[PDB]
């Protein structure tokens, strides 16, 4: 099988900047090389086929070139909607084979999170469990530290985090941290707090509530 070696594997670049993604084929593929764009949670979309032919409707800032076995996708002046995973695809022979992908993130200025905390609902507590949710909204970069303190006691092993994909307009992220406790444990304590550390904050931010 033909191996397509795609580089780099991740890029982070600013709006207006130029980026280059390359794919080397392990054998001659003539010009039978396609570039695809895959937004998170969506199907791939055709950008370029036959190595350099721009598909109808694709913005002119996308262009493809060849230098033998090396194929290059260039995005000339990046836009916030360009965050995606990009793939090359050869179709000279079977099996068709893909590069392993380039994840492109839009780089932007640091933005501090807005923090929100949510107590468990009475409906959930009637089921025997208590989920406490902390929300970090619209921040950049993704790196953040969320510590749960229950009656000023630090928690470990009982929370899980999830992060969104970048916003197509302002390139920020949101993050949720969910502290799960048994109902018995939740009733034994009063102050529930999430402390958020992020480089966009001059000092940690704590949001808390009192059970009741």
């Amino acid at each position: 099988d033909i191996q397509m070696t795609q580089s780099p594997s991740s890029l982070s670049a600013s709006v207006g900047d130029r980026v280059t993604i390359t794919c080397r084929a392990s054998q001659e593929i003539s010009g039978y090389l396609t570039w695809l764009q895959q937004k998170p949670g969506k199907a791939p979309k055709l950008l370029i086929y036959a190595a350099s032919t721009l598909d109808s409707g694709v913005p002119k800032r996308f262009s493809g070139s060849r230098s033998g076995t090396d194929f290059t996708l260039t995005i000339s002046s990046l836009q916030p909607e360009d965050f995606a995973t990009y793939y090359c695809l050869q179709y000279t022979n079977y099996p068709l084979t893909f590069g392993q992908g380039t994840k492109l993130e839009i780089k932007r200025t640091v933005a501090a999170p807005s923090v929100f905390i949510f107590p468990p609902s009475d409906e959930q507590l009637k089921s025997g469990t208590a989920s406490v949710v902390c929300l970090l909204n619209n921040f950049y970069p993704r790196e953040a530290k969320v510590q749960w303190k229950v009656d000023n006691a630090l928690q470990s092993g009982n929370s899980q985090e999830s992060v969104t994909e970048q916003d197509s307009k302002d390139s920020t992220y949101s993050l949720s941290s969910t502290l799960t406790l048994s109902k018995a444990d939740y009733e034994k304590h009063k102050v529930y707090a999430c402390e958020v550390t992020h480089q966009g904050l001059s000092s940690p931010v704590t949001k808390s509530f009192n059970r009741g």
Partner: protein, 215 residues
């Protein structure tokens, strides 16, 4: 409208058979071929097979004995059957169009993709719980203990789209998925505007609408 749409049961037990249908519109299956591609979660695309306009089929060699492809031109459908499914076959499965009868015709339009989960666990619909609320408040819904993926969340049957963040599902150690969906709204709307999270879990035929009230 040129479109391709995958459908079929999304949960397959180990050693049992996957059947996916690709329904096409805006072109004829005796003029265009249809490729099948899959993508394990977080991994790269992998090509599986193609059925050409004239009916010849080509397969990925290592998977060829497990794959069969049928065409129904009147129904505008191609059907992929994959036998002896294993957990490593959990993936989003895609069909995609290419002209004619030979591999050098580039594939152009892709379908939306369908998430196939291979597991011996049974289906379970979601429990939905409210996440109750400067001049901006946050509210949300916790969508907990469902299987398999995916669930879809909307707010106010689609009217509320700005500010909505629906987080990726987290697999819990129990094996059931959980996620939250949050939205930021003006605090001035909390007493007057109605906020309803609409949760649809097609694999279990479960629809839940949960109103979120500011406690």
């Amino acid at each position: 409208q040129v479109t391709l749409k995958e459908s079929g049961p999304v949960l397959v037990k180990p050693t049992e058979t996957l059947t996916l249908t690709c329904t096409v519109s805006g072109f004829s299956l005796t003029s265009y071929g249809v490729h099948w591609i899959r993508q394990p979660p977080g991994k790269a695309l992998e090509w599986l097979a193609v059925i050409w306009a004239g009916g010849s089929i080509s397969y990925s060699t290592s998977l060829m004995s497990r794959l069969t492809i049928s065409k129904d031109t009147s129904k505008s459908q191609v059907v992929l059957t994959m036998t002896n499914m294993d957990p490593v076959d959990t993936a989003t499965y895609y069909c995609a169009r290419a002209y004619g009868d030979y591999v050098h015709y580039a594939m152009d339009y892709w379908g939306q993709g369908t998430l196939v989960t291979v597991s011996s666990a049974s289906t379970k619909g979601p429990s939905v719980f409210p996440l109750a609320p400067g001049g901006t408040a946050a509210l949300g819904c916790l969508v907990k203990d469902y299987f398999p993926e995916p669930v879809t969340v909307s707010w106010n049957s689609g009217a509320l789209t700005s500010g909505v963040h629906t987080f990726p599902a987290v697999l819990q150690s129990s094996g059931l998925y959980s996620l939250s969906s949050v939205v930021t709204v003006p605090s001035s709307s909390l007493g007057t505007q109605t906020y309803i999270c609409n949760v649809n879990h097609k694999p279990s035929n479960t629809k839940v609408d949960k109103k979120v009230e500011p406690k």
